[PDB]
């Protein structure tokens, strides 16, 4: 079980997160700086977010040994995922929040019926509060319940390049990111983030309380910023390379605006239409719960 560590499940250290800065790994805090910010004459307003309708898909138990945690990490960051929004996997998960259910979430991220001995997991109460909230994403696709997209992205930007006087205020000028590069760097970081066990960071974002939370948000303010950037890459429209001195540089065109497609079909990772339907309803939950 591992019970739960007080101060997070992310303070354990068995499973952490390191972006591979080429031949040598690093920490998310250490990577953010290699990037600078260019203020352009465009402005976004921080728009309020609507509440999420409470109606997570009912319990079914088809027998699949569903890799729910693996599926989640794949769509947001994964390189060209397929059938991400199919209905069967989530429905199975929602069974989890149920008081008294022989169905334990494996530590490795695989869900089971009944149990096992050889495999340690997360105590049933930690997962109960988790699936209470991320089961809802399941039906994000329905015509009626479906979430926005062209507007949640007014938040992505403040975090990635949000100046402190800017996230203190409401409006931030449209920025333009640019950082050093190794050519295959955009895909390379996206290939890397896929294995962070992003389950651990979320299954504890619903279990931590009033003080343990105040300390959690003030430390992992990076581990969040990271997956936000890699995600904001697929969305922004034009990638321009600058050849200076003996250096080479990647510019991400606009941090805060949904172009609606492409980014660079070759220079980065792309988002299908069944991705904007997903990544959107995702951010609508983590953001709200986050703040």
């Amino acid at each position: 079980m591992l019970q739960q560590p007080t101060g997070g499940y992310t303070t354990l250290e068995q499973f952490a997160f390191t972006i591979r800065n080429d031949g040598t790994n690093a920490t998310p805090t250490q990577f953010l700086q290699l990037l600078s910010y260019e203020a352009t004459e465009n402005e976004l307003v921080k728009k309020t977010i609507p509440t999420p309708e409470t109606h997570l898909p009912s319990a079914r138990n088809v027998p699949g040994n569903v890799y729910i945690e693996d599926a989640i990490t794949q769509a947001l960051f994964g390189i060209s995922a397929q059938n991400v929004n199919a209905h069967g996997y989530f429905s199975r998960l929602s069974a989890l929040a149920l008081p008294n259910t022989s169905a334990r979430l494996g530590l490795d991220g695989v869900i089971y019926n009944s149990e096992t001995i050889n495999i340690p997991f997360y105590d049933p109460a930690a997962v109960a509060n988790f699936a209470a909230t991320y089961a809802k994403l399941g039906n994000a696709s329905t015509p009626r319940y479906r979430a926005d997209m062209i507007d949640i992205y007014a938040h992505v930007g403040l975090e990635l390049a949000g100046t402190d006087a800017e996230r203190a205020a409401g409006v931030m000028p449209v920025k333009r990111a640019k950082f050093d590069s190794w050519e295959g760097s955009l895909i390379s970081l996206s290939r890397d983030v896929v294995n962070w066990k992003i389950l651990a960071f979320l299954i504890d974002l619903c279990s931590l309380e009033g003080e343990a939370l105040r300390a959690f948000k003030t430390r992992n303010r990076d581990v969040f910023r990271m997956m936000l950037f890699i995600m904001s890459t697929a969305v922004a429209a034009n990638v321009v390379n600058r050849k200076v001195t003996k250096r080479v540089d990647r510019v991400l065109e606009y941090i805060g605006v949904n172009s609606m497609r492409t980014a660079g079909r070759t220079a980065t990772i792309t988002y299908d239409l069944s991705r904007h339907e997903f990544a959107a309803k995702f951010l609508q939950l983590t953001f709200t719960r986050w703040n």
């Binding site: 898909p57 079914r60 088809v62 699949g64 693996d70 599926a71 199919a86 209905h87 069967g88 001995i117």
Partner: protein
């Protein structure tokens, strides 16, 4: 609660057939009658002698202290017939007499702990109840057919032929036929301990150890959740989407009114200038003569034999033009998954799904299509396409060792692919005596 504990009730006829003839073989005094007064003292002391762990209920009200002695000791009670259990013991303070209801389980007759008896198990009853019903002449026919398939001749089994009467036939349906001795009167005596040989002690009529041990193993393959591939019922809806795998049950939408189908709520009345088949909303009592514009409902057809053709069309049109969720039950079908490429081989109609005979099971194939290469970047677009009309709700996904053994670029599994389980890949060891055991774990 817990859907367990409390008290254990069984009908008197079930007691006499299984329990009474089996505890009778041993030399134990017959189970003590439950007292009209209270005996929470010797209830188990007189039950200790019999070893049966069951107590015969007769008359009166069971005491409060005797009401809790039955709960803790796991002892059983047999009542002649239960209309209620309220007045049988008069549940005093807590709420039990007839509120937090019963359930349905099986005993396997494990409450003997005495070997050489109770050879069969739970599963044999499930098969019997699964059976329809067999008449005397049907049983006689069934015995004949299994006999003649294996060369074993039956010149005249089950009938007596007198030369001055002709040929008179008897029935062949015995049960627990325990060969016992007749007294001059004709009335059945008793075991006859100390005489009679003892070979007539039991038994279920089979070739000693050989058949009983062979049947025991073979019976388990019959009751396995991989062989039973006869799925029941089908839900019919008109939501239009594409799904990678079969057995996709589309859950009923957020806010619906579930109405039970009746042979009454559909009436024929005049609207405009013509005669039309009209729905009648049960909770509000309204008209809606049009096949469209009716408030959405969740229908449930049980009798799909009495409905007129016009009612079926109304049902099969309101699903299309008003988003009704309809349901069928008497329909029986055998489902088998179909590869994405090549397409379908057989297609049925929505009019035949409403007229199919009760006991005639047809097969309707479900499209898999999990692994299918997507179109190229440069090609003509589409315009408002596929609508799917039928959905299984059993569900059908039963036997699969693994599925879609193709790698998705590059080192990862394709979405919704399974691998073989850690059970068909474990060769264990023999028992401390005679049969196969597992690893074991930990």
């Amino acid at each position: 609660d817990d859907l367990d504990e409390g008290i254990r009730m069984t009908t008197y006829d079930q007691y006499l057939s299984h329990i009474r003839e089996r505890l009778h073989i041993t030399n134990v005094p017959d189970p003590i009658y439950i007292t009209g007064a209270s005996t929470p003292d010797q209830i188990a002391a007189s039950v200790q002698a019999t070893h049966v762990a069951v107590v015969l209920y007769q008359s009166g009200v069971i005491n409060g202290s005797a009401s809790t002695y039955l709960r803790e000791n796991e002892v059983l009670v047999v009542m002649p017939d239960y209309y209620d259990v309220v007045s049988r013991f008069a549940n005093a303070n807590l709420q039990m007499n007839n509120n937090r209801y019963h359930e349905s389980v099986l005993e396997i007759a494990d409450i003997f702990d005495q070997a050489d008896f109770i050879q069969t198990s739970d599963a044999v009853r499930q098969l019997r109840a699964l059976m329809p019903t067999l008449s005397t002449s049907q049983i006689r026919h069934a015995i004949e057919r299994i006999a003649q398939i294996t060369d074993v001749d039956s010149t005249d089994y089950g009938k007596l032929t007198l030369r001055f009467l002709g040929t008179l036939t008897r029935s062949l349906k015995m049960q627990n036929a325990q060969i016992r001795r007749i007294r001059p009167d004709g009335t059945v005596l008793r075991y006859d301990d100390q005489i009679d040989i003892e070979a007539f002690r039991w038994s279920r009529y089979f070739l000693d150890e050989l058949r009983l041990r062979r049947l025991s193993v073979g019976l388990r393959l019959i009751t396995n959740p991989r062989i039973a591939r006869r799925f029941d019922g089908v839900r019919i809806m008109y939501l239009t989407d594409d799904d990678p795998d079969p057995d996709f049950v589309p859950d009923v939408p957020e806010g619906y009114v579930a109405v039970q189908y009746a042979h009454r709520l559909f009436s024929s009345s005049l609207a405009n200038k013509r005669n039309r088949v009209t729905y009648t909303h049960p909770p509000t009592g309204m008209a809606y003569p049009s096949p469209t514009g009716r408030p959405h409902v969740h229908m449930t057809i049980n009798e799909r034999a009495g409905m007129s053709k016009l009612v079926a069309d109304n049902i099969i049109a309101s699903v299309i033009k008003s988003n009704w969720v309809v349901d069928i039950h008497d329909i029986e079908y055998t489902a088998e998954v179909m590869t994405p490429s090549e397409g379908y081989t057989q297609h049925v109609d929505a009019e035949s799904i409403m007229t199919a005979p009760k006991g005639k099971l047809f097969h309707l194939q479900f499209m898999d299509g999990l692994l299918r290469p997507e179109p190229s970047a440069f090609d003509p677009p589409a315009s408002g396409e596929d609508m799917r009309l039928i959905y299984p709700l059993q569900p059908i996904s039963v036997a699969r060792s693994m599925r879609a053994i193709v790698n998705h670029n590059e080192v990862d599994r394709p979405r919704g692919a399974v691998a073989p389980s850690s059970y068909e890949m474990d060769t264990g060891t023999l028992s401390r005596n005679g049969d196969l055991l597992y690893s074991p774990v930990a």
